Amino acid sequence: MQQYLRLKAQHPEILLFYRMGDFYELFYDDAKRASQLLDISLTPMAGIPYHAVENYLAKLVNQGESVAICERKVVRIVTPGTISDEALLQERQDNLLAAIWQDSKGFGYATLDISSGRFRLSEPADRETMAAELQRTNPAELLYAEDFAEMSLIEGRRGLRRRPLWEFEIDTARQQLNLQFGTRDLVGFGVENAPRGLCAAGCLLQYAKDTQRTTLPHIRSITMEREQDSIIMDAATRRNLEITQNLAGGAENTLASVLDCTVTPMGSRMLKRWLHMPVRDTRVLLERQQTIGALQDFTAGLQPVLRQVGDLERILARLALRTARPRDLARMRHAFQQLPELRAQLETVDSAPVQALREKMGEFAELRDLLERAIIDTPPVLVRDGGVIASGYNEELDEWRALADGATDYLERLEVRERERTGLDTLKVGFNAVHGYYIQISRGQSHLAPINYMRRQTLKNAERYIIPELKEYEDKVLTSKGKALALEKQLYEELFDLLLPHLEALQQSASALAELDVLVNLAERAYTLNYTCPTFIDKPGIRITEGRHPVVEQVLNEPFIANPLNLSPQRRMLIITGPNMGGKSTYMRQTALIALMAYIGSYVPAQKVEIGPIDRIFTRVGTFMVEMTETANILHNATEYSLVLMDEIGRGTSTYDGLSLAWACAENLANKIKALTLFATHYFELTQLPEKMEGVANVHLDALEHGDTIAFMHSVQDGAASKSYGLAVAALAGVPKEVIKRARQKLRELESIS
Template structure:
C-alpha cells in the first residue's frame, strides 16, 4: 500500500481538478510530473522517467528545469496536449509546513501567448462552435493579439472557414461531443485540431450576451454590430468562459468583438484554397512555393499576419479595392518614400503581441524595451506619411499614435539592456526611485562605509588599533584589545569577549548592519514591485497600442505590395463592376518569381462575361493548361486584394467567389473515392456559383470511364453556360468538348500550342485560340521512360479507338457539324454514335465486290430507305 505524503496529497488534490492536462508541479528549481503524466511526458519529450520512492510504493516521476520549462511546454503543445502550471505561491523559507501551491495558468494549443510557442506571421486561433442544425455559430479569437470575431454560417461552409482560419483548438458543447460523435470526429480527423468539450450552459446565447456585455463594460452589443447575431453569440460566450478559466489573469486586451462580414469578401471553399496553394503547398504543406510565400515581404509580424488575411479573404466591393489600390500606387510611384518607410518598419517589433503580454501580466523588461524601441520609430514614420495624398495613407497617418508618454515612461524607468528575469534585479534605471538608489548604494558601497566608520571611531576614541569586523554569528562588531579597555566609550555595547580583546556594537553600526545585509534582497524586491507598477501603467495604454499596431500592419502590407510591384514589373489592374475579365501577358505570380520574368511565357485571357463566358482549353499533359487556369485565378485574387499583378494590362470585373476543381485525391477516411470527391466539389460549384463567380475546372470527369466522363463534362459545361453564366475556364483532355463551341456562341476553344517533329514534341506554353484533337499522352509517356514496346502497342490501340469514334467525315460523333452549320437552337446532343451515323458507317464498310449484284443492290436499297427515314 502506498502511503500518501502531505506533498503528494497536495499534488493529488490539484491533479483531480485538472485531469485533462499535464500538471507541471513546481518543486524547487524543477517542474515535476507524476504517475501517467510522467510517463506521457517522458515519451513525448524524451526525458528520463524515474521514480519517487522504491519498491511497491514507487511513483513514476519526470521533471524539467523551471528556467527551461517553456522549451518543453512548446513541444507538448505542438503534440496537441494541455499543460497546467502549478507554481509555489509562497517563499519556501517562510512556509511552516507544505509550501502553498496552485495552478496559475493552463496552456492549451489555442491559448498560448509566448513568442516561442507562436509563428510570427500567423494567427493562432481558438474557435468555438455552437451547432444548432443547419446554422452554426462560430467564434474565434487570437489571444496573443486580442482579435475576436463571430459569424453565423450554414453547415456546408464550416470546413471552408476551417481552411481559412486554421484554428489550433476547438471548443464544443458537451452535448455535441456526447450525442453527435460523427460531427466531432469529422472535425478532429479532417482538421487535425484539438477538441475541448465545455459545459452546455457556457454556450447559452442569453448567458453569453450578459457575459460579453460585462466583459466589455457595456449595456449592449449594438456598438459592436453584434446585436442581431444568432448562435455565434453563444460560441463567443464560451470562448470568454474558457479564457477566464485557463488564463487566470486579466483579459482586458480583448477590447472589442467584430461581426465577420462575408458580403464584402471573396468567398473560397476549402478545395479552392488548397488547390490554389494560397498559404501552403499541396505537396508538403510548406509556405515556400505558395502565393503567400511569394507576396510576403512584410517587415513586421503584424504586417505579415494582415497580408495573410488579405490573401485568404480578398475584397469584393470595387470601391474598397480601389481605396487600397490608390495607396499602393502612391507608394509604388514614390520609390524614396517606399524605401524609407520600409526601413523604419524593419526596426519595429510585434507591438500587437507585446501589448497583449503587458496587459496579461506576462511581459518582462525586455518586452518593454522592445516596445520603447518600436515607439521611437513612430514619429519618423508619421512624418513620412504626412505628405501622402492617397485617402488610405492620410487616414493611417492620422491613426498612427506615437504614444510619447509610454516611450518616456519606459525610457526613464527601464535600463537599456535588462536581464530576462524580473525578480533578480538589474531592471530599473538609476535615478528613477531614490529609495532604490539608496538600497543599491548600501549594497554596493558597504565596505567603504565601514572603512569610514572605523576611521571616525579611531579618531573619536583615540584607539589606533580599533577595527570593525564581521562574522555570521554576531554580524558587524567593533573589536578593541584589552590594552585600551579603559578608553572604551560608554555608548559601546559589549557583545563578546575573546582572548586579549572585547567586541562591541553601537546602535548606529547595528542599524547600518540591518540595512547592508538586507539591502541587496530589498533592492531586488523593490525593483520587482516598481516593474509591476510600470507594467501596469503601460497596460492602461493597451487600446491605443492596438490601434497603432493595426495602422502599422496596414502600412506594412501596402508598402510590401508596392515594393513587389516595383521589383517585378507588376501593373495596376482596372477594377470594374462589369463582368469583363481581360488580362494581357499575364504571368503566374509564383512561377514568375521562380523562373524569372524572362523565362516565363506570358498568356492572355479575355472573357467579356456576356457573349463570351466559357473557355474550353485542350492540350497535352505538361503543356501548361493547369498552370494557365490557376494563373488566371491567382491574378484575379491578387487584383481584388488591391495588389498590382504580373501582367502588361488588365481589366478585372470583380468576382464574388472563386471556385476550383483541380487534381485528383480521395478521402478514404470518409469512404469517398477520388471520383466521389471530384463530384462533391463539382456539385458545390454548380449549387453555389453565381453570374459574378470565377470557375476554374481541371479535368472534370476523369475519375470514371471515358464515355461517362465525357458525358458528365459535356453536361456540366452546358449547365454552366446556359444556367449560371459564370466566367469559366475548363481545362480538359476530352477534346470532344471542343464541339460545344459549334453549338454555343459564348463557348470558345483554346489550346496550348505544341510543335511536332516526327515523334518529338515541343511544348510552347502559349495559349492560342482553337481546339485540338490530340492529347499527346503517349508522347508524354515516352518522355517519362515507359518501355518502347508499350508505347508502340499504345499507339496501335489509340488508332483503333479513334477510328471507332469518327464519323464518315473523320470528325468526332459527339456533335454533328450539320447541326452547328444550320444554327439550330442549342440542345443537348447524344454523346454516342446515332443510328444515322451507324447506317452511314455500315454503307461505307459495305464490300460490294464480294457480293452478288442482286444482293448488293437489295442491301444498298434497304440501307438507303433506313437513312431517309432517320434524315426525315
Template sequence: MAETYTPMIEQYREIKRQHADKILFFRLGDFYEMFFEDAEIAARELEITLTGRDGGAGRRVPMCGVPFHAADTYIARLINKGYKVAICEQVEDPKQAKGIVRREVIKIITPGTVLSDVLLPDKSNNYLVVIHEQNDIITMAGADISTGECYWADFAGPYRLNTLCDHLYRLSPAEIVLTGLLTDKETLDTFLANRLHGCTITNLAIENSETTQELLQHHFPDEELPHSGAAIAVGHLLYYLHQTLKTDLSHVNRLMRYNAAEFMTIDTAALRNLEITRNLRDGGRKDTLLSILDFTQTAMGGRLLKKWLEYPLLSVHEIIRRQDAVDELLTNPGVRQVLQEKLGHIYDLERIVTRAEVGTANGRDLIALKQSLSSLPTIKLHVQSMQSALLGEIGAKMETYEDIVALIDRAIVDNPPHSVRDGGIIKTGYNQELDELREIAQDSQQWLMAFEAREKERTGIKSLKVGYNKVFGYYIEVTNANRAAVPSEYIRKQTLTSAERYITPELKEFETKVLGAQEKIVQLEYYLFTIVRDCVKKHIPRLQETARQLAVIDCLVSLSEAAARYNYRRPAITNNREIIIRDGRHPVVERLLDREVFVPNDTELNHHDCEVMIITGPNMAGKSTYMRQVALLVLMAQVGSFIPAREAAITPVDRIFTRVGASDDLATGQSTFMVEMNEVAHILKHATTNSLVILDEIGRGTSTFDGMSIARAVIEYIKDRIKAKTLFATHYHELTELAEQKKGIKNFTVAVKERGSEVVFLRRIVPGGADKSYGIHVARLAGLPKKVIERAQTILAELEQYAVAHVLAATALPAPQAHVSLFSDPIIEELLKVDIMTTTPLEALNILFKLQKMAKEGSGR
C-alpha cells in the same frame, strides 16, 4: 489501509486531480517537477531522464523535471504535440510558510492559449475557436489571445457545416472547443482529421450559463454584443480563456463580426489547389502566392497580408482605395524605402502589449516597445504626406507616444536581463531611493577591502582574508597556523580542515546593512518596473490600434514592392461583369523559372460571347497553369494588388471554385473519381453567375463515354443554369462541338509546333480545338524507356488501322439508297482528315462515333 504519501506528494496529487487532463508542472525550487504518469509522459516526449523520489510509505514515485528558467522550450514541445500544461507555482514565501509551502495553478497553457514567443509563429495567427450550434445555426467564436483579436460568425442553411469547415481551414486554429451537441459531428471530425489533423479538440461543459453571459456583458460594449446564439459561443470563449489564462483579458477589447458579404469566398479546395498561403507539398509557405508577395517588415504586417489573400474584397470602392495607396507608394520609391527601413525596426507590438496586459512582459519587451515607438514620428510624417485616401487617413490618426518612449528611456536600462526579479533592470538616476541603496552596495567592496587591511595590520596575521558565501554570509578566515594570534573579540563561525572562520560585531553589522540593501534593491527594482509596465497597460487599446495601422501600411508597402520588383501593372476594377487580361503571367511559376521566359497569355471572359472557355491540348502543355493563373490574377486584383499582366480589367467575383488534380481520400475510403464528383457537386450547388469556376479534366476517373457524358452535362448545366464565368480544360475533343451549339462557349487550345517526330509545346493559349493528344510524346518526356516508347508507337499504329477498318465496316450500308452514299462528300472529307499514324485509340473511337452519326443522318435514320 489507504496508501499514504509525503505531504508534498499529497499536495501534488490533490492539485493534479483538479487538472487530470493536463501535464502538471509543479514548482520545486529552481525546477518544475512532474510525478507519476505525467513524469513518464514528459520523459518520453521531451527525451529527458526519468528518475524517482521517495513518496512515502516506503515507495518511490516516478519523477522528472526541467529548469524553470528554460521551461518555455519544453512547454513548447509538449504543446506542439497536442498536450496541455498546467503551471503550478509557490504562492507564499517559504520562509514564512507553516508546514508545506502553499501552491496553486496560476495558468494553463493549451495550443490555443499560448503567449510565449517560443510557442508562436511570427507571421501567423494562433487561433482558439469555440463552436456552438443552436436552432440550426452554427456559431463560431474565435480569438487570437496573443494579438487581442476576437470575432464571431454565423453559418446557417443546409450547407452550414461545409461553410464552417472552409472557414476553419482558412483560420487553421490551434485548438477548437466544442460546446454542446453538434449536428453531423462525424463530418466535422472527418474534416479535422484530413485537413487540420494537428488541431487540438477540447470539449467544454458549463452548467451555469449565467456566468458566461455576465462575462460577455462586462467585457464588450453593448453595441458589439451579438444575438442570443452567438452570445453563448462568445461567452463560452471568454469563460475558457479566463479559466486558462487566469487574467482579466483587458487586451481582448474589440468584438468583430465576420460578414461574408464583404469578402470573396474561397473554399478549402480552392485555397489548396491555388496554393495561396499553403503549398500542396507540405503545407508550408514556400512557393505560394503569399511567399511571392510578402515583403512585409513586421510580424503584424505578415499576419495581415495572409488574411488579405485568404479574404479578398468584394467592394469595388475598397479595392480601389488599396490600389490607390499601392500606386502612390510604387511611384514614390524614396518614401517606400524609408517606410521599409523604419518598419524593419518595429517589433511585434500586438504581442508585446498582450504580454504587458497579462503581466509577462519583461524589460526586453519594454525596450522593444520603445524602439518600435521611436520609429513612429518618421512613419507618420511620410504617410500623412501621401495623397491617397487610405494612407492619408492612417497618417492623420496615427499617434507617436513620445510620453511612453520618454518614460521607458528614463526607467529601463538599454540591455536589461531576461528576468525581472533579479535586479539590474532600472537605470541609475530614475529613483533616488534605489540610487542610495546601490551606493551602499557599491561602497561595500571598498569597505571590505579597507576592513581586511585594517584587521591584518591590527592582528599581525598577513594571511587573514575576508570572504562571503550564501550559507554563512560574511566571515574572516584565519589559517590554523595563526590561530594563536586571533583576537578574543573574534567569534568562531565555521571550522574548516585547515582554517577557522570568524565574525565580529562590526562585520555582522555591515552584513546586515549590505544584505538588506541588496534585497531591497531587487524588490524596489521589480516594483519600479511594474509601475512602468502598468503605465503601458493604460494605453493598450491605443497601442493596438497603432499596431493595426502599421500592419496596413506594411501590407501596402509590401504590395508596392512586389509590383516594383516583378513589373506588375494596376488592373482596372469594373462593374461590367467581365474579366479581361492581356499578357497575363502566373505570379508563382514565373518566379520559379531559371532559364525559361514565362509565356504570357490573354483571357477574356464575359456573359455575352465567352462565358465558358473549353481548353483542349496535350498534357504538360500548360492548361492547368493557365487556368490557375487566371484565378490567381483575379484574386490578387481583389486583394488590391497589382498583377503580372500588360493590362487588365476585372470585375470582382463572389467566389472562386477549382476542381483540379487527382487525389484519393483514403481516410474516408473515397476513390479519385468519387472525390472529383464530390467537388464538382459542391461547385454546382454553390456557384453563382458572379463566380469564377476552374474545372480541369472532369470525368477522367471513369470509362471514356461515362466521363465524356458527365463532362458535357456539367458544361451544359453551368452554361444554361448557373452562367458562371468558367474555364474548362479537357482531353475530350468531342466537347469542342458545344461551341457550335451554344452561344457563349468558345474553344481554345495550347499551340503546338511539330518538327518531324519532335513536338514543342509553345505554352500559348489560342482560339480553336486540339486534334491530337501527344500522349506518347509526353511519355517520352517523362523518361519511359526507349523500347517502351517504340513498342507503344507500333501498338498505336495497329490500333489506329484496326479502328479505321471498323469505321469503314460500321458505315457500310446493306443496300444502296438514292439519297446516301458511303462516299458522300462529308464522309470523304472526314476520312481524308484522319492521320492514321498519330490517331490514338480514343480518337479512333471518336471518329467512328462521328462517322456513324453522319451515316445515320445521311440515311435518314
C-alpha cells in the same frame, strides 16, 4: 508520490506536469501520450528539465494540449488558444481560440486572438461553409457544445474541448459580452441581431477569462464576418491555391512566401489574414490600390524604420495581462522612438488614408520620455533580479544604491588591506549564499591565517574565514541591495499603471503600424515584381493581358510565359485542350490567383487586368470520388459571378461515362450557372461544344518536338488542340519501338470512329 493522484481529480482532461526535484514527472494514462508527443522515454514515469520546460510546453501546446504544472497545488496552466508569451507563440502566425455550436437552423462561430484582442464571430448557414471557416481560421483550440451534432466537421482537430451546453445560453452570453466591452447593447458592434454567433462568443469569452483569471481590457470589441462580404473559398480551394500552406504541409513555394516581405511580425500575420479574406467591396480596395501606389516611392525610406517598431501588438497584450517584462517595455520604447521619423515621412504622401494611418499611428511622447528615464538601455530579461530602472529616475533608489556600492567598495579595499597586512597573495574576498561574505586563503598558505580569522568552510585547495568587520559590511550590502530591489519592482509596477490608460490608443498604433507594414510591403512587391493595378468592371468578367502565376515566376529559373485571358458573359467558358504537364493547371491557378489578389487590393502580375465582381472561387485542380464530390459542390453552389476552374474531370472512370459527365458539366456551367469557367479537358469530343452552344470557346496548349526531347510550352492559343503527346512521351521514356507503333495503330483506329 501518493499526492499526485488525488489532485489529478482537479483537472482530468489535461496533462499534469508534477514537480519531483529539477524535473516534471507525468504518471498513468498521461505519460503514454506525453512521450508519444515529445520524443521522450516512458519508465509509468516521464519528465523534463526546469530550464527547458518552456519548450516542452510550447511543443505540447503546439499540438492542442493544455498543460498543468504542479509545485502543494496546481500553480500554472496553459492552453493552446490562450497563451500570450513570446516563447510559446510562433513569431509570424495567428493563434486563435474558437468556439463552435449548433442550432437546428445552423452554426454559430467565434474566434479570439488573445494577443491582439481581435475578436470575431460568424454564423455559417450550411455544412460546407462552417467547414471552410474551420479551415481558414485554423483554431488552435476548439470549444464545442456537447450537444453539437455534426462532429465529422471537427472530429480530428487538435485541442478540442467539450463544454456544457449552458455555456451557450444567449442571455448569459449577452450580459457577459456587454460587461466586457462596457455597453448596454452590442448594436454598435453590428451583432445584437445575431444570437447564434453571440453564443459561440459568450462561451469563448467565458473560457478565455478562466484560463487567465484576469481582466482582458484589450478585448474591447467584436465584429461579425458576413458571407456576402467575402469571396468565398472552400477548404479545397484554399489548399489548391497554396495561399499560406503548400499542398505538402510546408510554407515555402506558396503565395505568401512571395508576397510576404513585411518587416514586423504583426504585419506578416495581417497580410496572411487579408490573403485568406478577399473582400467583394471595391470601395475598400480602390482605396487600398491608391494607398499602395502612393507609397511606391517611399518604400526604401519607410521599411527599415518600420522594422524597428517590432511586434508591438503582442507586447501590448502582455501589458494588458500585466505580464510584460523589462525587455518588452524596452522594445515598446524603441518603437516609440521610430514613430516621429515615420510621421515625418508620411507627411508628404498624398493619400487621405496614408495620412489617416499616420494620425492613427500616434506619437506617444509622454510614454517615450517616461521609459527613456525609467529603464536602462538594455535591461535583463526579468525584473526578478533588479538592474532595470535607470539611474536618475527616482532619488530614493539612487540613494539605496550608492549605499550598497560604498559597502562593495569598502570590501574591495578590505581585500587589499588584508592582502597587505598578511603578505599572502592568494587572499581574496568572495560572496556565497551559504556563508555570505568571506575572506579566502590558498591551502598551502592558509596556516598563516591571522589568529582573529574564524574558519567556516574548508574547500579542497583553499580555506574560508569571517571577521566581525566583514560580516558587519555584509549587513550593509544586503540591506541596501535588497531595499533597492524592492523599489525597482514598485517603480516598475508603476510603469504599468502609467502605461495602461493609453492602452486603447496604443492598440490603435500597433494596428495602424501593422497595416502600414502590409501596404508598404505590397507596394514594394508591386514595384519590384512588375505588377499593374487592376481595374474593376460592372458585369462579370476577367480580361487579362500578359498575366502570370505570381509564385511559379519567382521560383522556376526557366522563363515564365505570360498568357492572356478574356472571359465575359459573351465568352463565359474556355474548353482548354492539349497536354497538361502543369501548364493547363498553371494557367488556371494564375487566374484564381490574379483574381484573389485583385480582390485584396494588391497589384497583380500582368500588363493589365480588368475584372468583374466575384463571389466564390472554385479550384478543382489537384480517387475519382474526391474529384466528383468536389465537382458536386461546384455545381450546387456556383452563381454566375463565380470563377470556376476545372481540371480534366472524367479521368479515372470509363471513356464514355467520363466524356458524358464532362460534357454534362460543361453544358451545366455554361447554360445553367453561366459562371466564368476554365474547363481543362482531354476529351477532344468536347471541342465541338462551341458550335452546340453559345458563349463557349476553344483554346489550347501545344508542344514543339526538337532534337531528342519535347518542348511542352506554356502558351495558350485560340482553337482546339490538333495533337496528342502520350505516345510521344512513351517513346522518350523507353517503351519498345514495336509497342509504340502498335499503340499508334490503335490510336488512329479509335479516333477515326468519332
